[PDB]
């Protein structure tokens, strides 16, 4: 810590000690069902863009590593999560959306985007977490005469709020005259067909889009995947895993009055203070494992190589990862003597340490304020000096320091 | 707003006002000396137990070593402040078991051995009035490990890597130093601060103190019971004011409150995202892949490092202020307690006589005993007196007249005396002083020579 | 003895050494050498890495300047104190207790030191002490006599008057005492004779 | 003679002028004007700037 080979007399804060964990705990709900990605990722016909189907997925084990064999897509484009980490963590609710768009509008399926699909047909929230899966479907959604099954809504009266669906088909008016259900002057039908052909370019091919949205709430985890559960171990420094969140600490029984809808207890510094077991209906505490500071008390290396160690703020029967217990921690390597000298190395609340010859060893003592005196006071007694001494002392005061100038362009950049 | 009452002093070129009585007043001065010592583990605060965060934190260089050095320097400086204020005496003087200091009652400021802590009545009142946060200088991880009732603020502060260190001198040692200074001040006077303690009776020490402020020492010996009663009533008023109102100790309460509030802000800054997707490091580590979690973790590292740097800079500025106040308290202990100070409005308002230190949490309390003139009266004055073609000037004093006869009296108390050649001196004649008057000057040799 | 001036030297050396050592850090970039970043990457990516290095080095330089400002405040407070000590101890005689050394101040001498000043304070310390019996006043012919500038002491049989800081006993005389009132009000007045020359 | 009080005035004026002039810097973004950033780009890129 001092980056040197000789140290001077004093007390130095070197490092910090910590109790290492010894066990790993994984706590997951007992779910055996398998999530039906098979019934979603292939179909004869997907739904249209204006009338997209929403499928609720709950209470199953979700394997996301199988999705690659099911459709020929390149990118498993996720936003709030990562595709490779979808099995470790786990969710509350999963929703699946299905529609077929043109390849020009694949980039419109993203949070904070506008256009034609994103403004009228399918709008994503700004704080969206989840994955968007899209792949080419020229083989199944193209005809030489033209595929008119898929339709998109051209324009609306106002912009669409996120995750909303519009089915009703009323004739739009952009003027003063009423249309009266007849597409005459200034009257347009809102729905227009894609009309897919195999002779089209690479940007106008049909594209099947499946959007998986993950609900990351504080509710009990209804749907999540295959993690092997571990038996519950209490009163030990463990590495727990409660429904996908990791941590390190001890788990104890609690007397907190959790309401039946409450699952977690939060701290002021926004960390999980209490947790509920997903298998049994019992709440637990999370207290971090034992730690503190370590200070090394030494004389100079030209005197001795002996040291004493001070574990600050630790009851000394709890020490491991001469023993004397002070109010600043406990001291290992220095013996307490029933004497009082001047303070040499300051430790704590009235305790000092020194290197004394009574074999040389490091001792700890209570510091002495000075000699005891009692002036002989009386109501008719005075003391008057008869001589004098002339004493010359020395006072040292700093006045000025080194003047420096820094060239910031040469420091930061250097030509 | 009102600046005060309007006053108009009746000024004239031959009118003077001289006090005929006095009061003994005891005031109270409160000064902060030291503040709470803290140490911060930057690795546990920024990261905790995350090894990826630690390996990303090592790329920032020595932004932790110099924060540690600054906090260590502040912690050493606080103990130096307490040592330079209180440890100004070489020996622990003891007061005698007899408690007759000339009728002055010092029982409220002297220690009582019946208490487990040898502190006076006023020191106990001062320690009870300044409420404390009960910081973690006493060992506290045994209390934090046992989850009883709710979670305290200090347990969260300790869990997040913020540690409070205990001061080197305990409150018993501060009270012992204060008791030694008090015992030396009553028993010896100012002699114990300039060498060895020379004993003197307290009445004669007070006569020396009155000679310091310009009053003849016969004023004390003829008014010893009145001065003792005034001192006792002033000490009782100090006791009643400290028992009733606790708003005087706002400086020490602010010293406690600022250091609680800064640590609370430092803990509350861990809930912030700083532009990342989560404030929890484990959620970022278990939610995204290596590169993107590295990006979010670096954003969190930058935010937490900035908040820690802001805390250290504010602590350095507060340490500069506290060191200035401790230097002032050391000067006041050297000059008010160990001696008698002629500087105006230093050592209390009035004419300073004595002072007494009293220990308080995070500071010191001075009880300044001063002399205040009370009841004045109008007179007629002259600069000199013409007598036999000579101009007489007073040696120490002032010429006053009660309408018909001319006297000479000292300035700070009305004690009129016959004008004599012993208390006057001659310089020149009567043709140069403006405002001279005609009067006779007594000669003590003539009636002794004629008899 | 000169540890204060030694610490003034040491802090200003250590701050510059830390500022030099801070140039070897990466601050999240792929390298700390700037030419390696410029040669190994194109314009946009090297702009990103250089921006990280610029932010880190600018923050370290700001930390150095703020620390220098606070140390300058401390040094200016100490220099103001040394100027007051030069004006009051060297250029005069000071009645302030524990200013200008411990004892009763007589003289002071300045000496120049690196980054500071050294004061040699010449003081007066009483040495050898003696117990005496004392009194506030002395009754004589129904009058109370107080000392002019001194204190009444007794060697056991005779009564003298002496100065307070040096044992120089003298005969009690109406020249060195003054009269105020009778002997019925002072607590502790003793009976003795007062010499009339 | 009153250069100390003049310096007390001048330091405050210079500090506030520097604080106003610091609003014209880009700090690595594409523009120092906030509405120009908000109109030129979409949500994510403007959030970075
Ligand atoms: C000087 O002031 C004191 C009080 O400051 C006066 O003492 C008071 O006298 C009255 C009348 O005798 C008593 O009722 C009070 O109890 C006294 N106060 C005490 C003893 O604290 C004193 O009389 C004044 N002297 C002159 C000459 O006016
Ligand atoms: C001014 O003070 C003098 C001295 O005390 C007063 O003179 C005395 O007055 C009383 C009362 O009348 C007489 O009994 C004394 O004989 C006087 N002493 C003398 C003349 O030496 C004088 O009355 C005072 N003048 C005032 C108050 O106007
Ligand atoms: C106290 O001091 C007086 C003054 O000197 C001492 O009296 C003298 O003592 C010497 C020594 O015997 C005699 O020669 C003188 O004749 C004495 N002079 C007078 C005027 O008495 C006295 O002895 C001292 N007492 C003590 C106890 O020290
Ligand atoms: C899961 O475990 C809980 C508690 O042991 C039990 O009540 C529940 O019936 C279990 N569910 C299944 C499907 O086994
Ligand atoms: C697509 O899913 C359907 C659903 O039953 C299944 O019959 C079909 O075999 C799947 N396609 C392939 C290529 O496996
Ligand atoms: C929902 O109702 C509001 C009425 O405030 C209307 O403006 C909006 O278009 C409706 N949305 C759908 C999808 O029907
Ligand atoms: C904690 O330390 C105190 C102080 O010595 C002691 O009384 C107590 O028993 C300790 N707690 C333990 C050992 O659990
Ligand atoms: C003076 O001191 C003696 C002994 O120390 C004591 O007996 C006496 O009471 C004191 N005088 C007064 C007036 O109390
Ligand atoms: C002194 O005061 C009186 C009354 O106020 C005045 O008449 C007189 O002129 C003053 N003396 C001088 C020298 O002005
Ligand atoms: C001194 O004051 C205390 C408390 O005010 C009182 O109890 C005590 O009697 C006083 N001392 C004397 C000698 O009267
Ligand atoms: C002195 O005289 C002035 C004016 O005559 C008067 O206002 C004042 O009350 C008198 N007394 C004192 C004590 O100043
Ligand atoms: C004072 O006396 C002298 C001589 O006796 C005389 O000349 C002078 O006028 C007198 N002064 C006053 C003010 O009466
Ligand atoms: C004075 O008397 C006290 C007690 O009677 C004694 O301890 C001391 O040694 C004597 N001498 C001096 C010089 O103080
Ligand atoms: C002093 O002398 C007077 C009379 O001469 C007498 O009344 C008094 O008692 C004496 N003092 C002592 C202490 O004996």
From Swiss-Prot, chain A:
What gene codes for this chain? S
Query: Which residues lie within the region annotated Immunodominant HLA epitope recognized by the CD8+?
Result: 147-155
- Look up what happens after changing residue 152 to F: Decreased HLA binding to NF9 epitope. Increased binding affinity to human ACE2
| Known role | Attaches the virion to the cell membrane by interacting with host receptor, initiating the infection. The major receptor is host ACE2. When S2/S2' has been cleaved, binding to the receptor triggers direct fusion at the cell membrane. When S2/S2' has not been cleaved, binding to the receptor results in internalization of the virus by endocytosis using host TFRC and GRM2 and leading to fusion of the virion membrane with the host endosomal membrane. Alternatively, may use NRP1/NRP2 and integrin as entry receptors.
Q: Outcome of mutating residue 374 to L, per the record?
A: In strain: Omicron/BA.2.12.1
Segments of this protein annotated with the region Receptor-binding domain (RBD): 18-240
Outcome when changing residue 371 to V? In strain: Beta/B.1.351, Iota/B.1.526
What does altering residue 151 to R do? Increased resistance to neutralizing antibodies. Decreases HLA binding to NF9 epitope. Increased binding affinity to human ACE2
Q: Between which residues do disulfide bridges form?
A: 35-60, 78-131, 90-224, 179-187, 237-289, 316-330, 343-352
Q: What is this protein called?
A: Spike protein S1
Provide the assembly information: Binds to host ACE2. RBD also interacts with the N-linked glycan on 'Asn-90' of ACE2. Cleavage of S generates a polybasic C-terminal sequence on S1 that binds to host Neuropilin-1 (NRP1) and Neuropilin-2 (NRP2) receptors. Interacts with host integrin alpha-5/beta-1 (ITGA5:ITGB1) and with ACE2 in complex with integrin alpha-5/beta-1 (ITGA5:ITGB1). May interact via cytoplasmic c-terminus with M protein. May interact (via N-terminus) with host bilirubin and biliverdin, thereby preventing antibody binding to the SARS-CoV-2 spike NTD via an allosteric mechanism.
Q: Where is this region: Receptor-binding motif?
A: 136-207
From Swiss-Prot, chain B:
Note the superkingdom of the native organism: Viruses
Q: Where is this region: Fusion peptide 2?
A: 139-159
Recorded consequence of changing residue 160 to K: In strain: Omicron/BA.1
Q: Where is this region: Heptad repeat 1?
A: 224-274
Q: Which sequence ranges form a coiled-coil region, renumbered to this chain?
A: 253-297
- The UniProt site entry described as Cleavage is assigned to 119-120
User: Carbohydrate attachment sites?
Assistant: 13, 21, 105, 378, 402, 438
Q: What is the effect of changing residue 8 to L?
A: In strain: Omicron/BA.2.12.1
**Which effect does the record note for changing residue 254 to N?**
In strain: Delta/B.1.617.2, Mu/B.1.621
SS bonds (residue pairs): 42-64, 47-53, 144-155, 336-347, 386-430
- Effect after changing residue 331 to I: In strain: Gamma/P.1
Documented effect of changing residue 396 to K:
In strain: Theta/P.3
Question: Region Fusion peptide 1: which residues?
Answer: 120-141
Q: Where is this region: Disordered?
A: 132-157
Role this protein plays: Precursor of the fusion protein processed in the biosynthesis of the S protein and the formation of virus particle. Mediates fusion of the virion and cellular membranes by functioning as a class I viral fusion protein. Contains two viral fusion peptides that are unmasked after cleavage. The S2/S2' cleavage occurs during virus entry at the cell membrane by host TMPRSS2 or during endocytosis by host CSTL.
Name under which the protein is recorded: Spike protein S2
* Organism annotation: Severe acute respiratory syndrome coronavirus 2
Counting on the full-length protein, the chain here runs from: 697 to 1147 of 1273
């Amino acid at each position: 810590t001092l980056k040197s080979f000789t140290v001077e007399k004093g007390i130095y804060q070197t490092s910090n000690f910590r109790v290492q964990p010894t066990e790993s705990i994984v706590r997951f709900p007992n779910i055996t069902n398998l999530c039906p990605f098979h019934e979603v990722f292939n179909a004869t016909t997907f739904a249209s863009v204006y009338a997209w189907n929403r499928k609720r997925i709950s209470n199953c084990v979700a394997d996301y590593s199988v999705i690659y064999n099911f459709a020929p897509f390149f990118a498993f484009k996720c936003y709030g999560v990562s595709p490779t980490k979808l099995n470790d963590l786990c969710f509350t609710n999963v929703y699946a959306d299905s529609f077929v768009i043109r390849g020009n509008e694949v980039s419109q399926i993203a949070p904070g985007q506008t256009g034609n699909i994103a403004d009228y047909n399918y709008k994503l929230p700004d704080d969206f977490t989840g994955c968007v899966i899209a792949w080419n479907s020229n083989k199944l959604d193209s005809k030489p005469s033209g595929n008119y099954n898929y339709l998109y809504r051209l324009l609306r009266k106002s912009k669409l709020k996120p995750f909303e669906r519009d089915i009703s088909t009323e004739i739009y008016q952009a003027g003063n005259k009423p249309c009266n259900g007849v597409a005459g002057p200034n009257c347009y039908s809102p729905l227009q067909s894609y009309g897919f052909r195999p002779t089209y370019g690479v940007g106008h091919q049909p594209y099947r889009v499946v959007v998986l949205s993950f609900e990351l709430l504080h509710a009990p985890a209804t749907v999540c995947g295959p993690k092997k559960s571990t038996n519950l171990v209490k009163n030990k420094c463990v590495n727990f895993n409660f429904n996908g969140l990791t941590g390190t600490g001890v788990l104890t029984e609690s007397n907190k009055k959790f309401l039946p809808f409450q699952q977690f207890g939060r701290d002021i510094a926004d960390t999980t203070d209490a947790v509920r077991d997903p298998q049994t209906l019992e709440i637990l505490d999370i207290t971090p494992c034992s730690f503190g500071g370590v200070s090394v008390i030494t004389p100079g290396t030209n005197t001795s190589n002996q040291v004493a160690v001070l574990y600050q703020g630790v009851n000394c029967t709890e020490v491991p990862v001469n023993v004397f217990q002070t109010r600043a921690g406990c001291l290992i390597g220095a013996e307490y003597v029933n004497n009082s000298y001047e303070c040499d190395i300051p430790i704590g609340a009235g305790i000092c340490a020194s290197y004394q010859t009574q074999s040389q060893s490091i001792i700890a003592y209570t510091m002495s304020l000075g000699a005891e005196n009692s002036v002989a006071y009386s109501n008719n007694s005075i003391a008057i000096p008869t001589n004098f001494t002339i004493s010359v002392t020395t006072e040292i005061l700093p006045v000025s320091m080194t003047k420096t100038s820094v060239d910031c362009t040469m420091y930061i950049c250097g030509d | 707003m009102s600046l005060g009452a309007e006053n108009s002093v009746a000024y004239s070129n031959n009118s003077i006002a001289i006090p005929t009585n006095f009061t003994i007043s005891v005031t109270t001065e409160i000064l902060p000396v030291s503040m709470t010592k803290t140490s911060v583990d930057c690795t546990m605060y920024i990261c905790g137990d995350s090894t990826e965060c630690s390996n990303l934190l090592l790329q920032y260089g020595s932004f932790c070593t110099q924060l540690k050095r600054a906090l260590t320097g502040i912690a050493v400086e606080q103990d130096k402040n307490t040592q330079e204020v209180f440890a100004q005496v070489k020996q622990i003087y003891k007061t005698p078991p007899i408690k007759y200091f000339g009728g002055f009652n010092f029982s409220q400021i002297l220690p009582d051995p019946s208490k487990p802590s040898k502190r006076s009545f006023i020191e106990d009142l001062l320690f009870n009035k300044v409420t404390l946060a009960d910081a973690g200088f006493i060992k506290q991880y045994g209390d934090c490990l046992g989850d009883i009732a709710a979670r305290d603020l200090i347990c969260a502060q300790k869990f997040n890597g913020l540690t409070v260190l205990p001061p080197l001198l305990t409150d018993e040692m501060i009270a012992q130093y204060t008791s030694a200074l008090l015992a030396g001040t009553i028993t010896s006077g100012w002699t114990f601060g300039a060498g060895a303690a020379l004993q003197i009776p307290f009445a004669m020490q007070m006569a020396y103190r009155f000679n310091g402020i310009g009053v003849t020492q016969n004023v004390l010996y003829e008014n010893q019971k009145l001065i003792a009663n005034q001192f006792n009533s002033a000490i009782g008023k100090i006791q009643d004011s400290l028992s009733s109102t606790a708003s005087a100790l706002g400086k020490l309460q602010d010293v406690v409150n600022h250091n609680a509030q800064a640590l609370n802000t430092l803990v509350k800054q861990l809930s912030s995202k700083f532009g990342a997707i989560s404030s929890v490091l484990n959620d970022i580590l278990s939610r995204l892949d290596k590169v993107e979690a590295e990006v979010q973790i670096d954003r969190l590292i930058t935010g937490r490092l900035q908040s820690l740097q802001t805390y250290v800079t504010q602590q350095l500025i507060r340490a500069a202020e506290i060191r200035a106040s401790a230097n002032l308290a050391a000067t006041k202990m050297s000059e008010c307690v160990l001696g008698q100070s002629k500087r105006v409005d230093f050592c209390g308002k009035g004419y300073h006589l004595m002072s007494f230190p009293q220990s308080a949490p995070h500071g010191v309390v001075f009880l300044h005993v001063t002399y205040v003139p009370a009841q004045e009266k109008n007179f007629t004055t002259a600069p000199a007196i013409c007598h036999d073609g000579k101009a007489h000037f007073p040696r120490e004093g002032v010429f006053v007249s009660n309408g018909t006869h001319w006297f000479v009296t000292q300035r700070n108390f009305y004690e009129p005396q016959i004008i004599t050649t012993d208390n006057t001196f001659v310089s020149g004649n009567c043709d140069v002083v403006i405002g001279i008057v005609n009067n006779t000057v007594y000669d003590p040799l003539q009636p002794e020579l004629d008899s």
